[PDB]
Amino acid sequence: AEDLDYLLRQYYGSQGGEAEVDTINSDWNQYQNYIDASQFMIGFSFFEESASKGNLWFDVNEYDPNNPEKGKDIEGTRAKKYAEWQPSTGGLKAGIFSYAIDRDGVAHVPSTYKNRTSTNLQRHEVDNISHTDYTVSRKLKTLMTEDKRYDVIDQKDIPDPALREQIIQQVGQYKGDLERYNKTLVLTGDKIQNLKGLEKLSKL
C-alpha cells in the first residue's frame, strides 16, 4: 500500500444496505489505515455483450424499447452513485473508474434476462456491438468536476495564508477534505498569526 499511487476497488453490482454501499463504507473503514482517500477509486462495470449470470451487474440503465438512448442516461445509475459517493473519513476519494469503457452507452440487458446462461442463452438487441461516443464517461467526469466538495480551499475557509498552506499539505486541497480528515495536523513556524478556519476540521 505504501508504494501504490492508487487502489482501484471494483464494486460492480449492489454492495448491500438501503443505499447499496455498505461494503464500500465498511471496506473504506479498513482501507483508510493504509492509504489516503486521495488514492482511493471505486469502479462500476458497463454491460458486456453476451454476459451470463455471474457477470450481470446492472450498473447502468436497462434497455427501454421507446428510448434507444437510455443507456447513455446516467440518472439513477450505480455509476452516478459512485461518482457522488465519498468516504465518511480521511477525505474525498480520487475518483471512479468503469469496466469495459468500450461499451459506454449500451443499455443493460433487461432484468428478465437476469439468469440467462452460457448454454441457456437468450440473446437481445443490446448484445450487438456498436460504436461509442463515451457519453456516459464524459457525463460522470463532468459531474465529479462540477461537485462543489472538490472546490479548493480558499481564504473564505482559512484566512491566514501560512496556516492554509500547511493544512492543504496535510489534509488535502479540497473543501470536502476538511469535514472528513480524521488524523493528525501539525502546525509549525512563526508565520502563522491566527488559527481561524481550524474549526472546520470537525473530525481531527
Partner 1 sequence: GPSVFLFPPKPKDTLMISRTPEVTCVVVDVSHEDPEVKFNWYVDGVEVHNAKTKPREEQYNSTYRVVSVLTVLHQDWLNGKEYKCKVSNKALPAPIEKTISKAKGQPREPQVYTLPPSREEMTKNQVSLTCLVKGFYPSDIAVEWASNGQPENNYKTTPPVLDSDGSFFLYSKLTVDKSRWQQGNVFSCSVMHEALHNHYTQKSLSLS
Ligand X SMILES: *[C@@H]1O[C@H](CO[C@@H]2O[C@@H](C)[C@@H](O)[C@@H](O)[C@@H]2O)[C@@H](O[C@@H]2O[C@H](CO)[C@@H](O[C@@H]3O[C@H](CO[C@H]4O[C@H](CO)[C@@H](O)[C@H](O)[C@@H]4O[C@@H]4O[C@H](CO)[C@@H](O)[C@H](O)[C@H]4NC(C)=O)[C@@H](O)[C@H](O[C@H]4O[C@H](CO)[C@@H](O)[C@H](O)[C@@H]4O[C@@H]4O[C@H](CO)[C@@H](O)[C@H](O)[C@H]4NC(C)=O)[C@@H]3O)[C@H](O)[C@H]2NC(C)=O)[C@H](O)[C@H]1NC(C)=O
Ligand Y SMILES: *[C@@H]1O[C@H](CO[C@@H]2O[C@@H](C)[C@@H](O)[C@@H](O)[C@@H]2O)[C@@H](O[C@@H]2O[C@H](CO)[C@@H](O[C@@H]3O[C@H](CO[C@H]4O[C@H](CO)[C@@H](O)[C@H](O)[C@@H]4O[C@@H]4O[C@H](CO)[C@@H](O)[C@H](O)[C@H]4NC(C)=O)[C@@H](O)[C@H](O[C@H]4O[C@H](CO)[C@@H](O)[C@H](O)[C@@H]4O)[C@@H]3O)[C@H](O)[C@H]2NC(C)=O)[C@H](O)[C@H]1NC(C)=O
Please report whether residue 142 would count as binding partner 1 according to CB under 8 A. Answer: no
CB of 91 to its own copies, least distance (A): 24
1/129 with CB nearer its own copies:
129
161's contact among its own copies, partner 1, ligand Y, none, with CB below 5 to 8 A by partner kind, is: its own copies
CA–CA distances in Å: residue 111 to residues 62, 114, 122, 177: 8, 5, 12, 38
Query: Site residues for ligand Y, window 95-124 (CB under 6 A)?
Result: 99
Residue 167 CB contacts under 8 Å (≥ 6 apart), including other chains: 153, 158, 178, 185, 197, 198, 201
Contact 167, 145 (CB under 8 A): no
| Contact range with ligand X by CB under 6 A, out of 10-18, 109-117, 167-175, 184-192 | 10-18
Please report whether residue 194 would count as binding its own copies according to CB under 8 A. Answer: no
Maximum distance among all Cα pairs of the chain, rounded to whole angstroms: 73
Contact map string, positions 40 to 79, toward ligand X, x by CB under 6 A? -----x--xxxx--xx------------------------
Please report whether residue 98 would count as binding ligand X according to CB under 6 A. Answer: no
Please report whether residue 123 would count as binding its own copies according to CB under 8 A. Answer: yes
10's contact among partner 1, ligand Y, its own copies, none, with CB below 5 to 8 A by partner kind, is: ligand Y
Query: What grid cell was written down for 116?
Result: 440467462
Contact map string, positions 147 to 166, toward its own copies, x by CB under 8 A? --------x---x-x-----
Positions touching ligand Y (CB under 6 A) are: 10-13, 45, 48-51, 54-55, 99
